[PDB]
Design a protein around this ligand. Structure first.
Ligand SMILES: [Fe+3]
Length: 329
């Protein structure tokens, strides 16, 4: 069943990918799916490599799936992550704004505060919050990156160009686009908040639970709700910025190996899915969080035949992104 060339971003993911390869070989027969690992410094290099037929698959944050669809890449989503539980699979999650208790400010008082984002172009960390704050940003609002930099009084926006928009990396110099940057991703943005670098972290509903095991510690944090009030972190269903689509594995439109990608991942979730193995775990890792797949994922679901990015994401989310680039107040 041939080999799937997986694209790992940076060393932590590369290590998890090698383990994935090794463990799959020990359980899957020389007749089944195998995994090869291609290491890149950023997801952008992964999209390039896959379009150039040098790699086959990579799991992309949903907000990045739309971009990957554009030419000359035209990658398509083939396998989606799902969350919650196997009994009731959720193909969406909640974007929330975590803050520290007693910090004294609401959503409409974010101007001048310091922000921690999962990464530029990502759903919860960027598209949803910046989409909501768009008109609050000072003019000229284009380029958006600078308008955001001027709005806050220091930020960490992984993957943003620190040369053109220096304040966007004030909280994480260089704005590294990988786990090499300790403040990259959901847990990285949260650490940026915990460490006291930022005042707010735009992450998902499970993020704080993934980083603080004791409720007493979580009680020192809160969420910013859209009605300009705050609520406990366990009340995200009644205090979130929006619901967004699951992250998805993408592949080429031509000779993309989506059939083998699904076969690989479907067998992988049975052998190494949640609570399945004591040797290897697809959804966790001793090397870090959200490596290759999100830790909050509980399994995979195959994307319908030939579905493209726009259709996968849905009209509501697609409109948001488009309205982020355009915008009018
Ligand atoms: Fe996300």
């Amino acid at each position: 069943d041939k080999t799937v060339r997986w694209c790992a971003v940076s060393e932590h993911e590369a290590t998890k990918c090698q383990s994935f390869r090794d463990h799959m070989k020990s359980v899957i027969p020389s007749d089944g799916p195998s995994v090869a690992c291609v290491k890149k410094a950023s997801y952008l290099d992964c999209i390039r490599a896959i379009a150039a037929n040098e790699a086959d698959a990579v799991t992309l944050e949903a907000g990045l799936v739309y971009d990957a669809y554009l030419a000359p890449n035209n990658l398509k989503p083939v396998v989606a992550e799902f969350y919650g539980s196997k009994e009731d699979p959720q193909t969406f999650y909640y974007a929330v704004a975590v803050v520290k208790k007693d910090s004294g400010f609401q959503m409409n008082q974010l101007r001048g505060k310091k922000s921690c984002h999962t990464g530029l172009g990502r759903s919860a960390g960027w598209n949803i919050p910046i989409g909501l704050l768009y008109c609050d940003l000072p003019e000229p609002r284009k380029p958006l990156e600078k308008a955001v930099a001027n709005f806050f009084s220091g930020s960490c926006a992984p993957c943003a160009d620190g040369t053109d928009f220096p304040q966007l990396c004030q909280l994480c110099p260089g704005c590294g686009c990988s786990t090499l940057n300790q403040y990259f991703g959901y847990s990285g943005a949260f650490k940026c908040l915990k460490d006291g670098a930022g005042d707010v972290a735009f992450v998902k509903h499970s993020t704080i639970f993934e980083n603080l095991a004791n409720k007493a510690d979580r009680d020192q944090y809160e969420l910013l709700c859209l009605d300009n009030t705050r609520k406990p972190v366990d009340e995200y269903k009644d205090c979130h910025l929006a619901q967004v689509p699951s992250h998805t594995v993408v592949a080429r439109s031509m000779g993309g190996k989506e059939d083998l990608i699904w076969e690989l991942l479907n067998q992988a979730q049975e052998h190494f899915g949640k609570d399945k193995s004591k040797e290897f775990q697809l959804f966790s890792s001793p090397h870090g969080k959200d490596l290759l797949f999100k830790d909050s994922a509980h399994g995979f679901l195959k994307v319908p035949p030939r579905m493209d990015a726009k259709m996968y994401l849905g009209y509501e989310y697609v409109t948001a992104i488009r309205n982020l680039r355009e915008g009018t107040c």
